[PDB]
């Protein structure tokens, strides 16, 4: 194991162990009863899965909600603030499925992908040395690619908050708030996020198949 392969193995494990450690530390912070003020108008009004007879506010979904909070760095301030703003939108069922799509298909999915890839790698931790350098670099740089998506998500979320707090029209013209959010969360963007994660998860799985 030459020095390039060594550092590369240590940094892959570091990034993996960071993500999963953050997740267990985020996990035993618990949550408010009101789920950061998103229960009443968002979580209690969407299904996480068509086959469940309960809504997203159910205790069944503690961990899924935790993943969404970790997707915003578990910054309470930001989650309350975005909670209040998306809650104004999802009061109108005509606009509720943009809030769902934004929360679940963006924040949740990006963070889920980081954690699943981390767990896949740590699951074969002792055998990463058997891998070639191109495959080790794909693993290493894959973390940088997911980080960009997470960075863009946190950016769009801070901007929504900044703009909502700077502009009275976004607080009263509900159809203007909708437009602002939709521009930041286009259907093209949702497909790019979906397809990137799909082929990062497939590529990771293929790379690890022989050390399994």
mmCIF file of C-alpha atoms in Angstrom:
data_model
loop_
_atom_site.group_PDB
_atom_site.id
_atom_site.type_symbol
_atom_site.label_atom_id
_atom_site.label_comp_id
_atom_site.label_asym_id
_atom_site.label_seq_id
_atom_site.Cartn_x
_atom_site.Cartn_y
_atom_site.Cartn_z
ATOM 1 C CA UNK A 1 0.000 0.000 0.000
ATOM 2 C CA UNK A 2 2.040 3.018 -1.273
ATOM 3 C CA UNK A 3 1.555 6.510 0.314
ATOM 4 C CA UNK A 4 -1.007 7.807 -2.279
ATOM 5 C CA UNK A 5 -3.214 4.680 -1.654
ATOM 6 C CA UNK A 6 -2.751 4.996 2.159
ATOM 7 C CA UNK A 7 -3.850 8.720 2.511
ATOM 8 C CA UNK A 8 -6.686 8.071 0.044
ATOM 9 C CA UNK A 9 -7.938 5.062 2.132
ATOM 10 C CA UNK A 10 -7.677 7.078 5.430
ATOM 11 C CA UNK A 11 -9.573 10.108 3.908
ATOM 12 C CA UNK A 12 -12.336 7.874 2.457
ATOM 13 C CA UNK A 13 -12.783 6.276 5.946
ATOM 14 C CA UNK A 14 -12.594 9.721 7.649
ATOM 15 C CA UNK A 15 -15.388 11.178 5.384
ATOM 16 C CA UNK A 16 -17.477 7.945 5.867
ATOM 17 C CA UNK A 17 -17.027 7.876 9.729
ATOM 18 C CA UNK A 18 -17.709 11.665 9.905
ATOM 19 C CA UNK A 19 -21.087 11.327 8.085
ATOM 20 C CA UNK A 20 -22.238 8.320 10.152
ATOM 21 C CA UNK A 21 -20.934 9.794 13.464
ATOM 22 C CA UNK A 22 -22.774 13.119 12.759
ATOM 23 C CA UNK A 23 -25.889 10.991 12.129
ATOM 24 C CA UNK A 24 -25.790 9.157 15.540
ATOM 25 C CA UNK A 25 -24.987 12.457 17.389
ATOM 26 C CA UNK A 26 -27.853 14.205 15.465
ATOM 27 C CA UNK A 27 -30.083 11.202 16.275
ATOM 28 C CA UNK A 28 -29.800 11.366 20.094
ATOM 29 C CA UNK A 29 -30.623 15.115 20.154
ATOM 30 C CA UNK A 30 -34.328 14.014 19.864
ATOM 31 C CA UNK A 31 -36.872 16.509 18.369
ATOM 32 C CA UNK A 32 -39.592 18.904 19.590
ATOM 33 C CA UNK A 33 -43.169 17.440 19.755
ATOM 34 C CA UNK A 34 -44.141 19.990 16.989
ATOM 35 C CA UNK A 35 -41.214 18.721 14.802
ATOM 36 C CA UNK A 36 -39.618 22.239 14.561
ATOM 37 C CA UNK A 37 -43.068 23.732 13.790
ATOM 38 C CA UNK A 38 -43.482 21.536 10.612
ATOM 39 C CA UNK A 39 -45.880 18.938 12.118
ATOM 40 C CA UNK A 40 -49.180 20.904 11.921
ATOM 41 C CA UNK A 41 -49.119 21.965 8.210
ATOM 42 C CA UNK A 42 -46.418 19.781 6.506
ATOM 43 C CA UNK A 43 -45.527 16.409 8.083
ATOM 44 C CA UNK A 44 -49.079 15.453 9.258
ATOM 45 C CA UNK A 45 -50.343 16.136 5.665
ATOM 46 C CA UNK A 46 -47.972 14.024 3.450
ATOM 47 C CA UNK A 47 -47.335 10.252 3.142
ATOM 48 C CA UNK A 48 -43.648 9.183 3.101
ATOM 49 C CA UNK A 49 -44.743 5.963 1.266
ATOM 50 C CA UNK A 50 -48.065 5.246 -0.526
ATOM 51 C CA UNK A 51 -48.370 1.823 1.293
ATOM 52 C CA UNK A 52 -48.284 3.300 4.858
ATOM 53 C CA UNK A 53 -51.679 4.226 6.357
ATOM 54 C CA UNK A 54 -49.947 7.036 8.394
ATOM 55 C CA UNK A 55 -48.549 10.504 7.614
ATOM 56 C CA UNK A 56 -44.886 11.697 7.869
ATOM 57 C CA UNK A 57 -45.456 13.031 11.499
ATOM 58 C CA UNK A 58 -45.795 9.427 12.836
ATOM 59 C CA UNK A 59 -42.995 8.080 15.195
ATOM 60 C CA UNK A 60 -42.388 5.371 12.507
ATOM 61 C CA UNK A 61 -40.543 8.266 10.666
ATOM 62 C CA UNK A 62 -38.336 9.612 13.521
ATOM 63 C CA UNK A 63 -35.112 8.658 11.578
ATOM 64 C CA UNK A 64 -36.323 9.928 8.159
ATOM 65 C CA UNK A 65 -37.116 13.325 9.817
ATOM 66 C CA UNK A 66 -33.695 13.190 11.540
ATOM 67 C CA UNK A 67 -32.052 12.717 8.061
ATOM 68 C CA UNK A 68 -33.924 15.854 6.782
ATOM 69 C CA UNK A 69 -32.653 17.888 9.843
ATOM 70 C CA UNK A 70 -29.035 16.654 9.279
ATOM 71 C CA UNK A 71 -29.486 17.746 5.579
ATOM 72 C CA UNK A 72 -29.745 21.335 7.034
ATOM 73 C CA UNK A 73 -26.748 20.703 9.426
ATOM 74 C CA UNK A 74 -29.177 20.356 12.412
ATOM 75 C CA UNK A 75 -29.229 24.200 12.684
ATOM 76 C CA UNK A 76 -32.473 24.691 14.740
ATOM 77 C CA UNK A 77 -32.716 28.395 13.722
ATOM 78 C CA UNK A 78 -32.779 27.556 9.986
ATOM 79 C CA UNK A 79 -35.197 24.580 10.339
ATOM 80 C CA UNK A 80 -37.763 26.683 12.374
ATOM 81 C CA UNK A 81 -37.425 29.557 9.864
ATOM 82 C CA UNK A 82 -37.833 27.283 6.775
ATOM 83 C CA UNK A 83 -40.593 25.407 8.663
ATOM 84 C CA UNK A 84 -42.608 28.655 9.112
ATOM 85 C CA UNK A 85 -42.122 29.661 5.423
ATOM 86 C CA UNK A 86 -42.886 26.249 3.749
ATOM 87 C CA UNK A 87 -45.837 25.877 6.238
ATOM 88 C CA UNK A 88 -47.423 29.031 4.653
ATOM 89 C CA UNK A 89 -47.228 27.262 1.233
ATOM 90 C CA UNK A 90 -48.363 23.696 2.198
ATOM 91 C CA UNK A 91 -51.559 25.139 3.758
ATOM 92 C CA UNK A 92 -52.706 25.259 0.107
ATOM 93 C CA UNK A 93 -52.853 21.577 -1.080
ATOM 94 C CA UNK A 94 -52.416 22.969 -4.661
ATOM 95 C CA UNK A 95 -48.767 23.844 -3.493
ATOM 96 C CA UNK A 96 -48.182 21.099 -0.813
ATOM 97 C CA UNK A 97 -46.524 18.647 -3.278
ATOM 98 C CA UNK A 98 -43.784 21.240 -4.181
ATOM 99 C CA UNK A 99 -42.990 21.401 -0.388
ATOM 100 C CA UNK A 100 -42.906 17.552 -0.163
ATOM 101 C CA UNK A 101 -40.806 17.257 -3.353
ATOM 102 C CA UNK A 102 -38.360 19.962 -2.036
ATOM 103 C CA UNK A 103 -38.010 18.453 1.455
ATOM 104 C CA UNK A 104 -37.930 14.727 0.465
ATOM 105 C CA UNK A 105 -36.539 14.628 -3.116
ATOM 106 C CA UNK A 106 -33.857 17.289 -2.266
ATOM 107 C CA UNK A 107 -32.678 17.702 1.390
ATOM 108 C CA UNK A 108 -33.630 14.177 2.578
ATOM 109 C CA UNK A 109 -32.350 12.367 -0.596
ATOM 110 C CA UNK A 110 -28.955 14.148 -0.700
ATOM 111 C CA UNK A 111 -28.343 13.334 2.996
ATOM 112 C CA UNK A 112 -29.682 9.747 2.690
ATOM 113 C CA UNK A 113 -27.227 9.243 -0.210
ATOM 114 C CA UNK A 114 -24.224 10.496 1.883
ATOM 115 C CA UNK A 115 -25.170 8.130 4.741
ATOM 116 C CA UNK A 116 -25.903 5.010 2.566
ATOM 117 C CA UNK A 117 -22.613 5.398 0.656
ATOM 118 C CA UNK A 118 -20.756 5.905 3.995
ATOM 119 C CA UNK A 119 -22.333 2.691 5.445
ATOM 120 C CA UNK A 120 -21.572 0.666 2.251
ATOM 121 C CA UNK A 121 -17.844 1.707 2.456
ATOM 122 C CA UNK A 122 -17.426 1.118 6.251
ATOM 123 C CA UNK A 123 -19.144 -2.305 5.783
ATOM 124 C CA UNK A 124 -15.984 -3.478 3.849
ATOM 125 C CA UNK A 125 -13.547 -1.052 5.651
ATOM 126 C CA UNK A 126 -10.788 -3.706 6.213
ATOM 127 C CA UNK A 127 -10.567 -4.548 2.448
ATOM 128 C CA UNK A 128 -10.339 -1.074 0.741
ATOM 129 C CA UNK A 129 -6.556 -1.733 0.239
ATOM 130 C CA UNK A 130 -7.490 -4.477 -2.332
ATOM 131 C CA UNK A 131 -8.876 -1.663 -4.649
ATOM 132 C CA UNK A 132 -7.059 0.123 -7.525
ATOM 133 C CA UNK A 133 -6.376 3.902 -7.415
ATOM 134 C CA UNK A 134 -9.002 5.017 -10.040
ATOM 135 C CA UNK A 135 -11.717 3.250 -7.935
ATOM 136 C CA UNK A 136 -10.357 4.727 -4.656
ATOM 137 C CA UNK A 137 -10.439 8.242 -6.272
ATOM 138 C CA UNK A 138 -14.065 7.721 -7.435
ATOM 139 C CA UNK A 139 -15.016 6.911 -3.789
ATOM 140 C CA UNK A 140 -13.009 9.931 -2.446
ATOM 141 C CA UNK A 141 -14.285 12.511 -5.035
ATOM 142 C CA UNK A 142 -17.895 11.121 -4.782
ATOM 143 C CA UNK A 143 -18.039 12.771 -1.319
ATOM 144 C CA UNK A 144 -17.028 16.122 -3.007
ATOM 145 C CA UNK A 145 -19.842 15.680 -5.595
ATOM 146 C CA UNK A 146 -22.531 15.057 -2.892
ATOM 147 C CA UNK A 147 -21.085 17.995 -0.874
ATOM 148 C CA UNK A 148 -21.848 20.346 -3.837
ATOM 149 C CA UNK A 149 -25.562 19.236 -3.826
ATOM 150 C CA UNK A 150 -25.764 19.691 -0.032
ATOM 151 C CA UNK A 151 -23.984 23.098 -0.356
ATOM 152 C CA UNK A 152 -26.513 24.248 -3.057
ATOM 153 C CA UNK A 153 -29.449 23.013 -0.837
ATOM 154 C CA UNK A 154 -28.210 24.978 2.248
ATOM 155 C CA UNK A 155 -27.557 28.009 -0.067
ATOM 156 C CA UNK A 156 -31.126 27.932 -1.565
ATOM 157 C CA UNK A 157 -32.556 27.472 2.013
ATOM 158 C CA UNK A 158 -30.585 30.442 3.501
ATOM 159 C CA UNK A 159 -31.666 32.587 0.437
ATOM 160 C CA UNK A 160 -35.396 31.709 0.799
ATOM 161 C CA UNK A 161 -35.015 32.750 4.501
ATOM 162 C CA UNK A 162 -33.005 35.971 3.758
ATOM 163 C CA UNK A 163 -35.410 36.984 0.913
ATOM 164 C CA UNK A 164 -38.589 36.143 2.926
ATOM 165 C CA UNK A 165 -37.273 38.274 5.833
ATOM 166 C CA UNK A 166 -36.168 41.167 3.466
ATOM 167 C CA UNK A 167 -39.377 41.382 1.341
ATOM 168 C CA UNK A 168 -42.921 41.888 2.734
ATOM 169 C CA UNK A 169 -44.443 40.775 -0.639
ATOM 170 C CA UNK A 170 -43.091 37.200 -0.074
ATOM 171 C CA UNK A 171 -44.881 37.314 3.367
ATOM 172 C CA UNK A 172 -48.309 38.374 1.868
ATOM 173 C CA UNK A 173 -48.392 37.363 -1.852
ATOM 174 C CA UNK A 174 -48.589 33.588 -1.346
ATOM 175 C CA UNK A 175 -48.359 33.021 -5.147
ATOM 176 C CA UNK A 176 -45.089 35.076 -5.219
ATOM 177 C CA UNK A 177 -43.570 32.889 -2.433
ATOM 178 C CA UNK A 178 -44.539 29.813 -4.491
ATOM 179 C CA UNK A 179 -42.766 31.197 -7.614
ATOM 180 C CA UNK A 180 -39.583 32.100 -5.576
ATOM 181 C CA UNK A 181 -39.314 28.512 -4.203
ATOM 182 C CA UNK A 182 -40.203 26.841 -7.588
ATOM 183 C CA UNK A 183 -37.366 28.783 -9.378
ATOM 184 C CA UNK A 184 -34.872 27.423 -6.756
ATOM 185 C CA UNK A 185 -36.340 23.828 -7.035
ATOM 186 C CA UNK A 186 -36.988 23.210 -10.785
ATOM 187 C CA UNK A 187 -38.049 19.740 -12.144
ATOM 188 C CA UNK A 188 -34.797 19.644 -14.211
ATOM 189 C CA UNK A 189 -32.824 20.140 -10.922
ATOM 190 C CA UNK A 190 -34.845 17.309 -9.225
ATOM 191 C CA UNK A 191 -33.972 14.944 -12.131
ATOM 192 C CA UNK A 192 -30.259 15.953 -12.011
ATOM 193 C CA UNK A 193 -30.201 15.221 -8.218
ATOM 194 C CA UNK A 194 -32.068 11.908 -8.742
ATOM 195 C CA UNK A 195 -29.776 10.737 -11.631
ATOM 196 C CA UNK A 196 -26.522 11.827 -9.951
ATOM 197 C CA UNK A 197 -27.358 9.942 -6.697
ATOM 198 C CA UNK A 198 -28.584 6.877 -8.655
ATOM 199 C CA UNK A 199 -25.292 6.542 -10.549
ATOM 200 C CA UNK A 200 -23.131 7.414 -7.493
ATOM 201 C CA UNK A 201 -24.945 4.608 -5.534
ATOM 202 C CA UNK A 202 -24.611 2.133 -8.489
ATOM 203 C CA UNK A 203 -20.942 3.066 -9.070
ATOM 204 C CA UNK A 204 -20.111 2.683 -5.313
ATOM 205 C CA UNK A 205 -21.898 -0.752 -5.183
ATOM 206 C CA UNK A 206 -20.031 -2.035 -8.349
ATOM 207 C CA UNK A 207 -16.648 -0.866 -6.936
ATOM 208 C CA UNK A 208 -17.255 -2.713 -3.599
ATOM 209 C CA UNK A 209 -18.770 -5.945 -5.074
ATOM 210 C CA UNK A 210 -15.403 -7.814 -5.196
ATOM 211 C CA UNK A 211 -14.434 -7.037 -1.476
ATOM 212 C CA UNK A 212 -17.792 -8.106 -0.063
#
